[PDB]
Amino acid sequence: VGSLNCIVAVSQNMGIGKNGDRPWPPLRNEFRYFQRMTTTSSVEGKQNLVIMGKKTWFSIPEKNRPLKGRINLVLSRELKEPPQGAHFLSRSLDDALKLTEQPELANKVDMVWIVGGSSVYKEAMNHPGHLKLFVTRIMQDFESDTFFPEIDLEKYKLLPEYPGVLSDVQEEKGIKYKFEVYEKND
Numbered sequence: 544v545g546s547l548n549c550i551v552a553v554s555q556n557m558g559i560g561k562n563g564d565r566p567w568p569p570l571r572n573e574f575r576y577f578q579r580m581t582t583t584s585s586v587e588g589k590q591n592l593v594i595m596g597k598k599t600w601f602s603i604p605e606k607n608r609p610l611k612g613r614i615n616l617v618l619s620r621e622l623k624e625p626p627q628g629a630h631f632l633s634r635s636l637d638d639a640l641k642l643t644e645q646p647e648l649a650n651k652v653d654m655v656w657i658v659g660g661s662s663v664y665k666e667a668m669n670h671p672g673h674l675k676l677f678v679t680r681i682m683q684d685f686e687s688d689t690f691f692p693e694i695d696l697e698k699y700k701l702l703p704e705y706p707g708v709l710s711d712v713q714e715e716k717g718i719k720y721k722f723e724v725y726e727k728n729d
């Protein structure tokens with residue numbers, strides 16, 4: 544395992560989901576960027592590991608499951624086995640990390656990506672160590688029922704830029720958004 548990262552799209556109210564769905568219409572290019580960031584390995588013969596809560600897994604259209612090109616890990620305490628189409632099940636992020644160390648994925652994993660939900664992000668955001676947040680800011684309010692936790696600027700620095708990430712305002716379906724990379728180490 545190389546790097547530990549979290550990727551999220553968030554509305555101005557810090558909304559990440561509404562009844563397990565996206566609180567905004569589809570954003571095909573925001574989606575393509577998500578697929579591109581998470582799938583791309585920085586080391587031949589390696590694939591990235593994607594981690595998600597039970598509920599983020601079930602919110603992905605059946606058709607898109609598993610996220611292809613990546614090892615899919617579902618994080619749950621109630622599940623006794625991995626949902627159909629998933630590859631591994633861990634009780635916590637710590638257990639999910641340890642598994643990496645097993646010669647199991649040890650030699651097979653480049654980067655690890657946390658793709659949801661608040662719980663899983665909240666807990667990654669507290670794992671001590673180096674972490675990067677790839678945030679997609681949707682520049683409007685959307686009714687939500689679940690939120691991203693508060694980013695601590697005394698801890699994470701917004702990078703002035705990052706290679707492979709557009710720096711300017713994007714626009715799809717009359718909804719503007721921008722990409723931000725935060726970095727922490729502690």
Ligand SMILES: COc1ccc(OC)c(Cc2cnc3nc(N)nc(N)c3c2C)c1
Pocket residue numbers: 550551552559560563564565573574577599602603604607657658659679
């Ligand atoms: C959350 O509601 C849905 C519905 C469909 C769906 O994938 C097809 C998803 C997954 C999805 C999509 N875009 C993202 N976009 C970003 N930037 N970050 C995410 N973590 C993310 C996720 C988890 C989430």
